[PDB]
Symmetry: C2
Subunit: 95 residues, 2 copies
């Protein structure tokens, strides 16, 4: 199974309630994007690399059907102003 | 459950065989460290952004035990010349 890791920092203007609604909306995308099987998210507690400033993590389990899906594109349309930086990684987890 | 996410880029001199050995050793750490419950790793395929690899470790208090642990310290002592940069995040996955 294939995973997508999203690492992000929100702009300073964005409030806590706004972030909770951002993640809740992204989690509910699972029910309307057939490619999306699972989503978890989390906030970094240790701030080991605070020079970089990334604060949150999203784990999505599945990608082209998702990328152009209007729900996915629409989510990007609504919330793009929320994030100051963003890294995306796609990979197959192994041992 | 608490997860540790490690994002890294290797030095250009590091070879594919070395990286494979790096990850197999890191994965076997689950056998030596009681706090370490599970490990997966993967290589980013998309290159959307310089980071190339991810490691997912499954366990916050029992993270301190891992961090100080001689096997974890020893792993860093062996292999830290391998990586050019790394990010580390600790979080509790939720939805």
């Amino acid at each position: 199974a294939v995973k997508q890791l999203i690492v992000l920092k929100f702009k300073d203007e964005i409030t806590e309630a706004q972030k909770e609604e951002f993640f809740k909306t992204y989690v509910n995308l699972v029910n309307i994007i057939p490619a999306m099987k699972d989503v978890y998210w989390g906030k970094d507690v240790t701030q080991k690399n605070k020079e970089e400033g990334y604060t949150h993590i999203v784990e999505v389990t599945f990608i082209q059907d998702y990328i152009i899906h209007p729900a996915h594109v629409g989510f990007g349309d609504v919330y793009r102003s929320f994030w100051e930086k963003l890294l995306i990684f796609d990979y197959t987890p192994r041992k």
